[PDB]
Amino acid sequence: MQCVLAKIVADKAIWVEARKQQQPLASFQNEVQPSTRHFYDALQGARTAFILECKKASPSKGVIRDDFDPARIAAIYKHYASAISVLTDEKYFQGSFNFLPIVSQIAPQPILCKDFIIDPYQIYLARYYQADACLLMLSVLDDDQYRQLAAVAHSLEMGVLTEVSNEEEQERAIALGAKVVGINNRDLCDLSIDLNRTRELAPKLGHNVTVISESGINTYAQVRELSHFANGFLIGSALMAHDDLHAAVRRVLLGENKV
Ligand SMILES: O=C(O)c1ccccc1NC[C@@H](O)[C@H](O)[C@H](O)COP(=O)(O)O
Incomplete structure (x- = not known):
């Protein structure tokens, strides 16, 4: 039919309205204090940084955490x-x-709002709920839109994870001087995965640009090999798909439980 991310944005627009009508910016606006946590800083260092995700279901796998909490x-x-x-x-x-x-x-770690942000309202909306940072996608926006939204988040003391999926987007995130670039291994159109995208798009990124590899990380071996290309990882399913959540972090992030 059409790209999956396409359908998603359609619904995201129809969603903000059904809520902009309900909870307009004015009904909370000048009441949201900046973020008292630093996302950008939290990802700095020579040590592999981890962005653990709380997800219950997804287009690619359906319901993941049968018992969410x-x-x-x-x-x-x-x-x-x-x-x-x-x-x-x-x-x-x-x-x-x-x-x-x-x-x-x-x-205590800086909280990241993982959503398809196409409206400044959304940023204002998440900051209200304590969202210490947000995700802006160059595959869903264009420079002007990004700058706009970028400026907005940088007003509320919120970090911005910039998502790139190809070389053109990578070059863009560079031109835009994005500080934290998340390289998505998943093709949001057909939901296919290719971890080489991380390998492909990170070398050029230069310093003062923290590279986060997102999606598809299932094993520790993958964490370990890809840690040669990215500063950190954003892992969802490899963790949410297991009941004993602590044992899962030991296997996947620590290469513990001796496998
Ligand atoms: O995960 C999906 O199936 C999906 C589908 C369409 C659009 C975005 C999607 N993923 C959202 C994204 O924030 C992913 O949850 C994270 O990158 C982590 O993925 P994971 O580690 O679970 O493979």
Whole structure:
């Protein structure tokens, strides 16, 4: 039919309205204080940085965590994460803006709102729920849109994870002087995965640009090999797909449990 990300944005627009009508910016605007946490800093260092994600379901795998509970998840993700990602999209990943606060309190790491942001309202909306940073996608926006949204987040003391999926987007994120570039291994059109994208698009990125490899990381071996190309990883399913969540972090992130 058509790209999956395409369908998603359609619904994201129809979603903000059904909520902009309900909870307009004015009904909370000048009441959202900047973020008292630093996303950008949290990902700095020579040590592999981890962005653990709380996700319940996805277009690619359906329902992942049959028994979701953003409370118990952050209770574990907090002992290891550099940052914690939270899908705030209900229709596709069964996420919810309320999960953000639920975590920002149980976990001290900067919270990242993982959603398809196409409206400044959304940024204002997440900051309201304690979202310490947001995700802007160069495959869903264009320079002007990005600058706009980029400026907005940088107003509320919020970090910006810039997602690139190809060389053109990479070159763009560079021209835009993006500070944290997330390279997505998943082709959001057909939902196919290729970890070489990380290998391909990171070498050029130069310093003062933290590279985060996102999606498809299933094993520790992959973490270890790809740590040669990226500064960090954003891992969702490899963790959410297991009941014993702590044992999962040991296997996948620490190459523990002796495999
Ligand atoms: O994961 C999906 O199936 C999907 C589908 C369409 C659009 C975006 C998608 N992923 C959202 C994205 O934020 C992913 O959750 C993270 O990059 C982590 O993925 P994971 O480690 O779970 O493979």
